[PDB]
Structures are given as C-alpha cells and as structure tokens.
C-alpha cells in the first residue's frame, strides 16, 4: 500500500508523474517563482511526466531555469495549466516544472 507515490491532475485525476521522478534542480526539487504577471508558483521539478499536452514552440523569455526554454504544459485530459516542459538546456537537456498545488498525491 504505497500511499503517496503518484501525482494526478487535481481537477480530473489524469496520471501526471511520480514521487520517484522528483528532480533536485540546483539542489532542491522545489522552486518558488513569479511570472511577469506577478503570479507566484511553487514549482516541483520532475525528470519525467505523462498525460500532459505541450502547447506551441519553446521560448527562453523569462525562463526561471538558466539555459532552458519552456513550453506550457496543460493536463492532456482537462486542459488545466499544470506547469511547463523545459528543453534546450544541459544536464539534463529536459525536465518538467509542475505547480505542486495543481497536483493530487496518492497511491500507485
Ligand atoms: O520559466 C518560466 C515559464 C514561463 C513563465 N511565464 C512567462 C509568461 C509570459 O511571457 C510572455 C510575455 C511576457 C511579457 C509580456 C509583456 N510584458 C512586457 C514587460 O514586462 C511586463 C509585461 C508579454 C508576454 C506571459 C504570460 C505568462 C507567463 C508565465 O507564466 C515564466 O515567467 N518563467
Ligand atoms: Zn486534468
């Protein structure tokens, strides 16, 4: 009964990621960040995620992670904004920054 091992979309229950997949970027999986619109996000970095829909082409504008371009990551099921896919960087080349409070943690 591994009780807190997967992350689902809080809105619809789509399978998104796993506690096992948390990635400490610059020493911490958690990054508290603000966009140009002044919205605060508690971002959890994951090496891997699924069940998302990545919108458009990458942009480096206002990237919170040096060397990485982002794409908006929506829940592929309900279209809720869950965070961003990061690419074009180094070690790793790619990862997901997901908004912690938009995910529900629960058993495998
Ligand atoms: O890593 C990341 C992931 C993406 C994330 N971003 C960028 C971003 C935007 O970025 C496009 C954009 C940015 C700025 C403007 C207009 N300016 C002009 C001067 O500054 C204030 C208003 C228009 C469009 C537009 C809307 C939301 C976000 C958002 O959440 C972020 O910040 N860092
Ligand atoms: Zn959803």
Residue numbers in the entry: 16 to 123
What does the paper say about this structure?
It is the target of the thalidomide-derived immunomodulatory drugs (IMiDs) and is one of the most widely employed receptors for proteolysis-targeting chimeras (PROTACs), both of which induce the ubiquitination and subsequent proteasomal degradation of target proteins. We grow MsCI4 crystals in complex with thalidomide, and then exchange thalidomide for the ligand in question in subsequent soaking experiments.
Compared with thalidomide, avadomide showed a slightly increased affinity, while a more than tenfold gain in affinity was observed for iberdomide. Most interestingly, the orientation of the protruding moiety was different in all three chains. While the glutarimide moiety shows the canonical interactions with the tri-Trp pocket, the phenyl ring is harboured in a channel formed by Glu76, Phe77 and Pro51 of MsCI4. While the glutarimide moiety of iberdomide is bound in an identical fashion in chains B and C, the protruding moiety is found in a very different orientation, filling a surface groove behind Trp85.
